Symmetry: C2
Subunit: 399 residues, 2 copies
């Protein structure tokens, strides 16, 4: 069959064959006890760059030696992109969230041979789940591959915003000293209240990392955590998102994107935050109304915004979050550190091996199968389409 694999470009200075360090650290398992990916074999060296076009997720030897054709490209947005020439006979489409091939209803409709949309990473909101349901496309993603990596990135951005890292590094590199300019907006997080929206693999992990900072922890979610967990971390529960925001100095979003959470942070909900609250979002950019966030920063309602997710992706060159006041943005990188890519590259192969030998794909990897939500998808997503507006990604130009 044909596999289209959409990956991001290689570094601007070429694809490296040697790295800052020699190996990755050992990891035996994930916190809830889920095993790591178990492909029958891997053909890449752990620690390399796997998610760019020249890395290929290490899938080429495997795929060809079995008769299939692997098309690799970064060209994905716009009516004359490479993805668009290959839709007519694609059996399998693979993309990562960081550089997502948006499978809208019109793209699925052009794709008669399409059986499997695979997300190399976590979060499958860049596929129209309704259309995937209607056309019997399987949708899978690599559960847990980077949950802990995302949680680290959250804590990094919370400390960075609150202590004012980025502007302070600028004063050091431009030759200044400027202590008062740096600490005019520098606080400790000790004693602050921080809440997470959702406390699944990422959000629970965030709570556990912030406990020894002596922050007061707050959460909300569909269901409560086990009473053992709440008493271990001394948690304060809020029955709704909207009651949580007013109680928090720092809010972190860690829920999925679907019609029930699209634009939940807007001009109306921002009125509920404390003046000078801090907001961190590494979940999905579309959880926030884009201009409402710039107004809150400009007015002082928010003291700081930080995240690595944007809508669409890539974000147009003039996307306002790039230059708004008091921001600690990065491009979408938390779930594609070198350490994570090796786990998701392995998981991607494990799903392909199952697909191609006719074995069942692990439930924890499933989002959509056989005309409805399935596996992890059933507990996390609503039927619906989040991919409207996605065309605007075609406006981005490489530097």
């Amino acid at each position: 069959a044909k596999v289209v694999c959409v990956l991001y470009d290689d570094p601007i200075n070429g694809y490296p064959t040697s790295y800052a360090r020699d190996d990755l650290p050992r990891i035996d398992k994930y916190p809830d006890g889920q095993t790591l990916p178990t492909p029958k074999a891997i053909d890449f060296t752990p620690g390399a760059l796997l998610g760019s076009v020249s890395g290929e997720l290490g899938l080429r030897k495997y795929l060809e030696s079995q008769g299939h054709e692997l098309v690799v490209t970064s060209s994905k947005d716009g009516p004359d992109s490479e993805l668009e020439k290959h839709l007519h006979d694609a059996e399998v489409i693979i993309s990562q969230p960081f550089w997502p091939a948006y499978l809208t209803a019109e793209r699925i409709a052009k794709a008669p041979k399409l059986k499997l949309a695979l997300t190399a990473g976590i979060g499958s909101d860049h596929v129209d789940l309704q259309a995937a349901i209607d056309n019997n496309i399987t949708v899978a993603e690599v559960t847990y591959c980077n949950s802990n990596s995302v949680a680290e990135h959250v804590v990094m951005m919370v400390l960075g915003l609150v202590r004012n890292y980025i502007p302070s590094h600028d004063w050091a590199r431009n030759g200044g000293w400027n202590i008062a300019d740096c600490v005019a907006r520098s606080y400790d997080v000790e004693g602050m209240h921080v809440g997470t929206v959702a406390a699944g693999r990422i959000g629970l992990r965030v709570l556990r990392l912030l406990a020894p900072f002596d922050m007061h922890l707050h959460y909300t979610d569909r269901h409560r955590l086990p009473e053992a967990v709440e008493k271990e971390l001394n948690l304060t529960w809020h029955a709704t998102r909207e009651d949580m925001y007013g109680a928090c100095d720092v809010v972190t979003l860690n829920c999925p994107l679907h019609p029930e959470t699209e634009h939940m942070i807007n001009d109306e909900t921002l009125k509920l935050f404390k003046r000078g609250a801090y907001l961190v979002n590494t979940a999905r950019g579309k959880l926030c109304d884009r201009d409402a966030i710039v107004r809150a920063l400009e007015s002082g309602r928010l003291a700081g915004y930080a995240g690595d997710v944007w809508f669409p992706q890539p974000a147009p060159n003039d996307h306002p979050w790039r230059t708004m006041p008091h921001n600690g943005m990065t491009p979408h990188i938390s779930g594609t550190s070198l350490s994570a890519q090796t786990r998701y590259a392995a998981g991607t192969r494990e799903i392909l091996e199952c697909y191609f030998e006719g074995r069942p794909i692990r439930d924890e990897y499933l989002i959509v199968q056989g005309g409805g939500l399935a596996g992890v998808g059933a507990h996390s997503y609503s039927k619906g389409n989040a991919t409207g507006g996605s065309e605007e990604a075609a406006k981005y130009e490489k530097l």
Copy 2:
């Protein structure tokens, strides 16, 4: 009497009277059970900028209403500075580590009336302790005022270096996306080995904050921690600094500066680190040989260096750490976040109230008294002078 208070400049755009947030968080106590500062009263509002010349540590009403003269200045380095005109009759000299008035042996010798050198903050290595001992100057500092604040700053810089925050934010603000360029040097800290030199108030607190990241924790110090603590955090002990370095992916320095630790990190000791180790230093800049660190980064021996302390301070405009490859530097700001300044401003007043009413200064604040080390000073410092080279601070020019 006369009090000279050396403080850093106000912000370049003036001294603000309103801030990003309305109050500071509550804190009742420090982890080892030490009480907060207990001055009989304070005359500043918590949360304001206290450490710059216009803030004055909130000490003016108190000092004058009791007959004393308060001289406030930022002019401190060089043979024609304001500190230098006021040495002849100064009874009390106050400075913070971030903007330190260096009391060398020659400066103490010009200071016949000098009875008390007070450090508003932590770390009194900018005073020549030998000369202070020889001339019967009392040296006190505000123990614990910002221990937790420094520990937060360490974790922030560890995550920032390792996940590659700073270069990634640059790609977002310059209009790029550039995922591969960002993650070419991006790892998770999960599973890495991290060691601290010294495990006192800061270093133990760092270990506790890194435990739930599932890092493997290593330490060294003068004496072991209680076996209860080692088993709680699953610690690996190293009897010497030099044995620790080779076992660690990430090394953090959290010890005092004195002749026994001056230049401990040099061309010779750097050969002992793992290739592509990460080094974070928020203790004192003089712990490191300045050029040896730039060579290790240039050769790949170190994958990253980060810290907020420099020697001298302020660092000359062309100090090499400002522009060396793979650095996450800031100017010296960790122990002077707004939250910390309120605790040290309070402690400074408590020491002055004691001094002036003839009550004993708390032992935990004492470094030098009556011809020898005393209090905290006895357990932490050697007799000796760390202030050689300090004159070079006069080369720094405001932007």
